[PDB]
Symmetry: C2
Subunit: 127 residues, 2 copies
Amino acid sequence: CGLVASNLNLKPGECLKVRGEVASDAKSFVLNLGKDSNNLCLHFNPRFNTIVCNTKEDGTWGTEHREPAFPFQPGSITEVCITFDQADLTIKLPDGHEFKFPNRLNMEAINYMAADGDFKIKCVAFE
Amino acid sequence: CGLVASNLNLKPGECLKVRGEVASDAKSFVLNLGKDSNNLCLHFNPRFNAHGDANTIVCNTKEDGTWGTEHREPAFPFQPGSITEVCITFDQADLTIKLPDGHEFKFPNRLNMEAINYMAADGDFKIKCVAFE
Protein backbone atom coordinates (compact mmCIF):
# COMPACT_ATOMS: atom_id res chain seq x y z
CA CYS A 1 0.00 0.00 0.00
CA GLY A 2 0.87 3.70 -0.28
CA LEU A 3 2.98 5.99 1.90
CA VAL A 4 1.72 6.51 5.45
CA ALA A 5 2.67 9.50 7.60
CA SER A 6 1.81 10.21 11.24
CA ASN A 7 2.46 12.98 13.78
CA LEU A 8 1.78 15.56 11.07
CA ASN A 9 0.39 18.15 13.48
CA LEU A 10 -1.23 20.08 10.63
CA LYS A 11 -3.10 23.06 12.13
CA PRO A 12 -5.84 25.40 10.77
CA GLY A 13 -4.66 27.67 7.96
CA GLU A 14 -1.74 25.41 7.14
CA CYS A 15 -1.63 23.79 3.72
CA LEU A 16 -0.83 20.16 2.92
CA LYS A 17 0.49 19.76 -0.62
CA VAL A 18 0.71 16.24 -2.03
CA ARG A 19 2.36 15.60 -5.38
CA GLY A 20 2.18 12.10 -6.82
CA GLU A 21 2.06 9.87 -9.87
CA VAL A 22 -1.26 8.39 -10.95
CA ALA A 23 -0.88 4.81 -12.19
CA SER A 24 -1.15 4.40 -15.97
CA ASP A 25 -3.92 1.83 -15.51
CA ALA A 26 -5.58 3.49 -12.52
CA LYS A 27 -9.37 3.75 -12.47
CA SER A 28 -9.24 5.52 -9.12
CA PHE A 29 -6.91 6.48 -6.29
CA VAL A 30 -7.26 7.24 -2.58
CA LEU A 31 -5.90 9.89 -0.26
CA ASN A 32 -6.91 9.67 3.40
CA LEU A 33 -6.41 12.39 6.02
CA GLY A 34 -7.31 12.51 9.70
CA LYS A 35 -6.24 11.42 13.16
CA ASP A 36 -5.67 7.76 12.34
CA SER A 37 -6.79 4.94 10.04
CA ASN A 38 -10.18 4.74 11.79
CA ASN A 39 -10.74 8.49 12.09
CA LEU A 40 -10.61 10.44 8.85
CA CYS A 41 -11.55 14.07 8.34
CA LEU A 42 -11.09 13.46 4.62
CA HIS A 43 -11.34 10.36 2.45
CA PHE A 44 -10.42 11.71 -1.00
CA ASN A 45 -11.44 9.21 -3.69
CA PRO A 46 -11.38 10.48 -7.31
CA ARG A 47 -12.75 8.02 -9.91
CA PHE A 48 -11.56 7.95 -13.53
CA ASN A 49 -16.04 9.86 -13.40
CA THR A 50 -16.53 11.62 -10.07
CA ILE A 51 -14.83 12.57 -6.82
CA VAL A 52 -16.11 10.71 -3.77
CA CYS A 53 -15.36 12.38 -0.42
CA ASN A 54 -16.27 11.02 2.99
CA THR A 55 -15.37 10.94 6.66
CA LYS A 56 -14.72 8.05 9.01
CA GLU A 57 -15.42 8.13 12.72
CA ASP A 58 -14.26 5.15 14.81
CA GLY A 59 -14.19 3.01 11.68
CA THR A 60 -17.66 4.04 10.58
CA TRP A 61 -18.02 5.66 7.16
CA GLY A 62 -20.07 8.84 7.09
CA THR A 63 -22.31 10.15 4.34
CA GLU A 64 -20.49 10.50 1.02
CA HIS A 65 -20.26 13.75 -0.89
CA ARG A 66 -19.73 13.64 -4.62
CA GLU A 67 -18.03 16.50 -6.43
CA PRO A 68 -17.77 16.95 -10.20
CA ALA A 69 -14.93 14.88 -11.63
CA PHE A 70 -11.45 16.21 -12.16
CA PRO A 71 -9.81 14.95 -15.36
CA PHE A 72 -6.84 13.29 -13.67
CA GLN A 73 -4.69 11.70 -16.37
CA PRO A 74 -3.33 8.17 -15.82
CA GLY A 75 0.46 7.96 -15.91
CA SER A 76 0.80 11.65 -15.09
CA ILE A 77 2.08 13.55 -12.06
CA THR A 78 -0.67 15.42 -10.27
CA GLU A 79 -0.87 17.63 -7.22
CA VAL A 80 -3.54 18.22 -4.59
CA CYS A 81 -3.59 20.76 -1.78
CA ILE A 82 -5.61 20.54 1.41
CA THR A 83 -6.27 23.24 3.97
CA PHE A 84 -8.81 23.39 6.77
CA ASP A 85 -10.48 25.53 9.39
CA GLN A 86 -12.90 24.59 12.15
CA ALA A 87 -15.75 24.68 9.63
CA ASP A 88 -14.44 23.25 6.35
CA LEU A 89 -11.58 21.49 4.65
CA THR A 90 -10.66 23.10 1.33
CA ILE A 91 -9.40 20.90 -1.47
CA LYS A 92 -7.51 22.60 -4.28
CA LEU A 93 -7.34 20.60 -7.51
CA PRO A 94 -4.57 20.92 -10.14
CA ASP A 95 -6.65 23.17 -12.44
CA GLY A 96 -7.01 25.61 -9.58
CA HIS A 97 -10.58 24.56 -8.93
CA GLU A 98 -11.49 24.31 -5.26
CA PHE A 99 -14.29 22.66 -3.34
CA LYS A 100 -15.12 22.61 0.35
CA PHE A 101 -15.91 19.66 2.58
CA PRO A 102 -17.37 19.95 6.09
CA ASN A 103 -15.23 19.33 9.16
CA ARG A 104 -17.97 17.05 10.48
CA LEU A 105 -15.79 15.40 13.13
CA ASN A 106 -14.56 18.76 14.45
CA MET A 107 -10.86 17.87 14.17
CA GLU A 108 -8.46 20.37 15.68
CA ALA A 109 -5.51 18.91 13.77
CA ILE A 110 -4.58 16.58 10.93
CA ASN A 111 -2.06 14.02 12.16
CA TYR A 112 -2.46 11.19 9.67
CA MET A 113 -2.06 10.80 5.91
CA ALA A 114 -2.17 7.70 3.72
CA ALA A 115 -2.31 6.96 0.00
CA ASP A 116 -3.29 3.64 -1.58
CA GLY A 117 -1.37 1.62 -4.17
CA ASP A 118 -2.91 3.56 -7.08
CA PHE A 119 -1.30 6.86 -6.10
CA LYS A 120 2.47 6.82 -5.66
CA ILE A 121 3.30 9.84 -3.54
CA LYS A 122 6.39 11.58 -4.84
CA CYS A 123 6.41 14.74 -2.74
CA VAL A 124 4.79 15.90 0.51
CA ALA A 125 5.09 19.49 1.70
CA PHE A 126 3.61 21.50 4.57
CA GLU A 127 2.88 25.11 3.63
CA CYS B 1 7.59 12.99 18.55
CA GLY B 2 8.23 14.45 15.11
CA LEU B 3 6.78 13.28 11.79
CA VAL B 4 6.90 9.53 11.27
CA ALA B 5 6.56 7.99 7.81
CA SER B 6 6.17 4.35 6.80
CA ASN B 7 5.90 2.38 3.53
CA LEU B 8 8.60 4.60 2.03
CA ASN B 9 9.84 1.82 -0.27
CA LEU B 10 13.02 3.74 -0.99
CA LYS B 11 15.10 1.55 -3.29
CA PRO B 12 18.86 1.58 -4.05
CA GLY B 13 19.91 4.58 -6.12
CA GLU B 14 16.87 6.63 -5.14
CA CYS B 15 17.36 9.91 -3.28
CA LEU B 16 15.36 10.73 -0.15
CA LYS B 17 15.25 14.50 0.32
CA VAL B 18 14.18 15.76 3.73
CA ARG B 19 13.73 19.47 4.34
CA GLY B 20 12.81 20.64 7.82
CA GLU B 21 12.92 23.36 10.44
CA VAL B 22 15.41 23.05 13.29
CA ALA B 23 13.83 24.08 16.59
CA SER B 24 14.97 27.48 17.88
CA ASP B 25 16.12 25.94 21.16
CA ALA B 26 17.63 22.83 19.60
CA LYS B 27 21.20 21.84 20.47
CA SER B 28 20.74 18.77 18.30
CA PHE B 29 18.17 16.86 16.28
CA VAL B 30 17.43 13.29 15.25
CA LEU B 31 16.36 11.76 11.97
CA ASN B 32 15.92 7.97 11.92
CA LEU B 33 15.87 5.71 8.86
CA GLY B 34 15.36 1.98 8.47
CA LYS B 35 12.81 -0.83 8.36
CA ASP B 36 10.89 0.13 11.49
CA SER B 37 11.40 1.96 14.79
CA ASN B 38 13.48 -0.90 16.19
CA ASN B 39 15.58 -1.51 13.08
CA LEU B 40 17.52 1.51 11.84
CA CYS B 41 20.11 1.64 9.07
CA LEU B 42 20.74 5.25 10.08
CA HIS B 43 20.43 7.10 13.36
CA PHE B 44 21.34 10.63 12.28
CA ASN B 45 22.02 12.73 15.37
CA PRO B 46 23.86 15.97 14.61
CA ARG B 47 24.81 17.96 17.71
CA PHE B 48 25.45 21.65 17.06
CA ASN B 49 26.18 24.52 19.42
CA ALA B 50 27.71 27.88 18.57
CA HIS B 51 27.95 28.41 22.32
CA GLY B 52 28.76 24.88 23.50
CA ASP B 53 31.24 22.06 22.98
CA ALA B 54 28.85 19.33 21.84
CA ASN B 55 29.65 19.74 18.15
CA THR B 56 29.64 16.46 16.25
CA ILE B 57 27.45 14.22 14.12
CA VAL B 58 26.55 11.01 15.91
CA CYS B 59 25.71 8.11 13.62
CA ASN B 60 24.61 4.65 14.68
CA THR B 61 22.39 1.71 13.80
CA LYS B 62 19.73 -0.10 15.80
CA GLU B 63 19.10 -3.83 15.40
CA ASP B 64 16.10 -5.38 17.14
CA GLY B 65 16.14 -2.37 19.46
CA THR B 66 19.87 -2.60 20.25
CA TRP B 67 22.22 0.28 19.42
CA GLY B 68 25.26 -0.67 17.36
CA THR B 69 28.76 0.76 17.42
CA GLU B 70 28.36 4.51 17.16
CA HIS B 71 30.35 6.50 14.60
CA ARG B 72 31.02 10.23 14.82
CA GLU B 73 31.40 12.50 11.78
CA PRO B 74 32.64 16.10 11.76
CA ALA B 75 30.01 18.55 13.00
CA PHE B 76 27.78 20.48 10.64
CA PRO B 77 26.91 24.03 11.74
CA PHE B 78 23.13 23.67 11.65
CA GLN B 79 21.60 26.93 12.81
CA PRO B 80 18.71 26.75 15.31
CA GLY B 81 15.43 28.16 14.04
CA SER B 82 16.43 27.70 10.42
CA ILE B 83 15.17 25.49 7.60
CA THR B 84 17.74 22.91 6.51
CA GLU B 85 17.94 20.01 4.07
CA VAL B 86 19.52 16.56 3.99
CA CYS B 87 19.49 14.02 1.17
CA ILE B 88 20.07 10.30 1.69
CA THR B 89 20.75 7.55 -0.84
CA PHE B 90 22.02 3.99 -0.43
CA ASP B 91 23.40 0.88 -2.05
CA GLN B 92 24.32 -2.54 -0.66
CA ALA B 93 27.61 -1.17 0.68
CA ASP B 94 26.92 2.31 2.05
CA LEU B 95 24.39 4.97 2.82
CA THR B 96 25.35 8.36 1.43
CA ILE B 97 24.34 11.44 3.40
CA LYS B 98 24.34 14.78 1.59
CA LEU B 99 24.58 17.84 3.84
CA PRO B 100 23.32 21.37 3.00
CA ASP B 101 26.74 22.64 1.88
CA GLY B 102 26.88 19.77 -0.60
CA HIS B 103 29.33 17.86 1.57
CA GLU B 104 28.86 14.09 1.72
CA PHE B 105 29.89 11.43 4.15
CA LYS B 106 29.23 7.72 3.90
CA PHE B 107 27.96 5.31 6.51
CA PRO B 108 28.07 1.53 6.08
CA ASN B 109 24.92 -0.45 5.37
CA ARG B 110 25.90 -2.81 8.19
CA LEU B 111 22.39 -4.27 8.45
CA ASN B 112 22.31 -4.91 4.69
CA MET B 113 18.98 -3.19 4.03
CA GLU B 114 17.67 -3.65 0.49
CA ALA B 115 15.07 -0.94 1.07
CA ILE B 116 14.25 1.89 3.46
CA ASN B 117 10.60 1.94 4.55
CA TYR B 118 10.69 3.93 7.79
CA MET B 119 11.61 7.50 8.71
CA ALA B 120 11.17 9.48 11.91
CA ALA B 121 12.15 12.93 13.11
CA ASP B 122 12.35 14.06 16.73
CA GLY B 123 10.84 17.12 18.41
CA ASP B 124 13.87 19.21 17.44
CA PHE B 125 13.38 18.83 13.68
CA LYS B 126 9.99 19.84 12.25
CA ILE B 127 9.82 18.33 8.76
CA LYS B 128 8.49 20.70 6.10
CA CYS B 129 9.06 18.72 2.90
CA VAL B 130 9.75 15.10 2.01
CA ALA B 131 10.63 14.25 -1.57
CA PHE B 132 11.53 11.17 -3.58
CA GLU B 133 13.99 11.92 -6.37
